[PDB]
Amino acid sequence: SPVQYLRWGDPAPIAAVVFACLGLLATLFVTVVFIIYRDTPVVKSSSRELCYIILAGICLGYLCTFCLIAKPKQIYCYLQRIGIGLSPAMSYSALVTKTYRAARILAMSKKNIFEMLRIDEGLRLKIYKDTEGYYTIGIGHLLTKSPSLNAAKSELDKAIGRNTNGVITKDEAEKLFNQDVDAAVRGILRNAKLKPVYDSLDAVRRAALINMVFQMGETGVAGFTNSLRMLQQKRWDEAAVNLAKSRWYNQTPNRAKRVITTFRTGTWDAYKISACAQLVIAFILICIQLGIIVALFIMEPPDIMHDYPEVYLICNTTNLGVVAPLGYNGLLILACTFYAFKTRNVPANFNEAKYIAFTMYTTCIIWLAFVPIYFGSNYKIITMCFSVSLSATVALGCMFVPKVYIILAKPERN
Ligand SMILES: CCCCCCCC/C=C\CCCCCCCC(=O)O
Ligand SMILES: CCCCCCCC/C=C\CCCCCCCC(=O)O
Numbered sequence: 228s229p230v231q232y233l234r235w236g237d238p239a240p241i242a243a244v245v246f247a248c249l250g251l252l253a254t255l256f257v258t259v260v261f262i263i264y265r266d267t268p269v270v271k272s273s274s275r276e277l278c279y280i281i282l283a284g285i286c287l288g289y290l291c292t293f294c295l296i297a298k299p300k301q302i303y304c305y306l307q308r309i310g311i312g313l314s315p316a317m318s319y320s321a322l323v324t325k326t327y328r329a330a331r332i333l334a335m336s337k338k339n340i341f342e343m344l345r346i347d348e349g350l351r352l353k354i355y356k357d358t359e360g361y362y363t364i365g366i367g368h369l370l371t372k373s374p375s376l377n378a379a380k381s382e383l384d385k386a387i388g389r390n391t392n393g394v395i396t397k398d399e400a401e402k403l404f405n406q407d408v409d410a411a412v413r414g415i416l417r418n419a420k421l422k423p424v425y426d427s428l429d430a431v432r433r434a435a436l437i438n439m440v441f442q443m444g445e446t447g448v449a450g451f452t453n454s455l456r457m458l459q460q461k462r463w464d465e466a467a468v469n470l471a472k473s474r475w476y477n478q479t480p481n482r483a484k485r486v487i488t489t490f491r492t493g494t495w496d497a498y499k500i501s502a503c504a505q506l507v508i509a510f511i512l513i514c515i516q517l518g519i520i521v522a523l524f525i526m527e528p529p530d531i532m533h534d535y536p537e538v539y540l541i542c543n544t545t546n547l548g549v550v551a552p553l554g555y556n557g558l559l560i561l562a563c564t565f566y567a568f569k570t571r572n573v574p575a576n577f578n579e580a581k582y583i584a585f586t587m588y589t590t591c592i593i594w595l596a597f598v599p600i601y602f603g604s605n606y607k608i609i610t611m612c613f614s615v616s617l618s619a620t621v622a623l624g625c626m627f628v629p630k631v632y633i634i635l636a637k638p639e640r641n
């Protein structure tokens with residue numbers, strides 16, 4: 228009984244139980260909210276099937292402390308190794324399929340802007356010079372400002388990853404072009420005149436604004452004071468009429484007409500330009516962890532330590548019984564963090580990606596700090612209980628609590 232150890236002067240078992248119960252309660256509250264309000268734009272936008280797999284992992288995470296703090300029975304040593312290994316794998320492998328899809332969607336958004344300027348601005352697959360003698364390649368991607376041609380091929384190989392001999396491909400010029408777009412968006416966000424208009428426009432019309440920035444510069448796009456105000460108010464027809472009167476339209480009419488048409492429809496007509504698959508891949512990534520656990524059951528069978536007479540249940544789990552599923556879970560965390568950081572600025576689903584990236588930042592530090600803390604500890608059971616509950620609470624508090632707040636507290640925003 229955890230209450231017996233509390234009055235005896237040890238409040239660790241009773242504290243880990245309350246932690247797990249409160250976590251089970253909050254996990255129960257969060258899940259019911261997503262079941263009831265399943266048809267609301269906030270829940271319908273993200274992957275609903277993957278969230279139930281994440282919440283089930285968090286649920287099993289808090290349940291781990293009930294087999295760590297349990298009576299000396301044999302199946303609990305089996306459930307310990309099966310929960311401390313699978314419950315993180317369930318949450319992280321479902322989250323890696325969510326973050327992987329968010330990155331492929333983001334990569335496809337840059338494929339349509341690259342084809343936009345390949346037709347409008349041009350593209351060279353070998354090194355040239357711009358109007359001021361700076362070595363350049365691709366769609367105006369500056370390589371260096373040194374007069375040495377060997378210096379350009381050096382930076383080019385360092386940017387591509389192979390010996391190019393001064394020649395690249397369309398996919399390699401796109402890799403350099405994505406860096407120029409990221410630098411252009413930062414310049415627009417650092418501009419007081421273009422920042423509000425950029426935030427109101429959708430993904431397609433943002434590309435048309437960036438198209439104008441690449442042709443005329445940030446200070447040149449800021450000159451369309453009236454048209455930018457029309458685009459912000461979603462007066463597309465008025466903006467296209469006003470833009471067709473500009474000197475920019477009369478000097479390069481073949482290009483300005485396509486950018487203007489994009490502002491009109493919000494589509495790519497002026498230019499030539501799975502759900503069940505996520506559950507299967509997540510299911511495959513969970514069975515791999517389970518296969519590791521079952522394989523270690525056969526190598527190192529679970530057994531109750533000693534032949535004793537206690538609240539603490541000591542099993543014969545070795546380092547390999549811990550490190551092998553711990554390392555696989557770590558790989559799931561690295562992959563999650565890689566795609567979460569890659570999409571940290573994606574604003575879809577009420578900035579859902581911002582909260583996922585922050586969750587993986589804390590998860591890495593928590594899991595990294597766990598290795599020296601645990602394997603150097605003489606209270607491994609309790610340090611394991613709090614670690615699993617803390618890591619489960621991070622994912623539940625950072626990813627789901629903000630989404631539940633918007634549902635109940637901000638019904639009109641949703
Ligand atoms: C870069 C971010 C990393 C985040 C995940 C880290 C997870 C750590 C997982 C496995 C590392 C295992 C190290 C075990 C060393 C042996 C311990 C021992 O047996 O004494
Ligand atoms: C910002 C804080 C990050 C903390 C980083 C900690 C890095 C530890 C990760 C892996 C080290 C594994 C080496 C073996 C651990 C044995 C520890 C021990 O025996 O006490």
Ligand SMILES: CN1CC(=O)N=C1NC(=O)Nc1cccc(Cl)c1
Nearest residue numbers: 284285288314315597614618619622
């Ligand atoms: C073994 N260790 C060391 C550590 O620091 N964390 C764990 N295990 C874990 O966190 N499992 C889990 C369970 C439910 C949800 C989530 Cl997100 C994670």
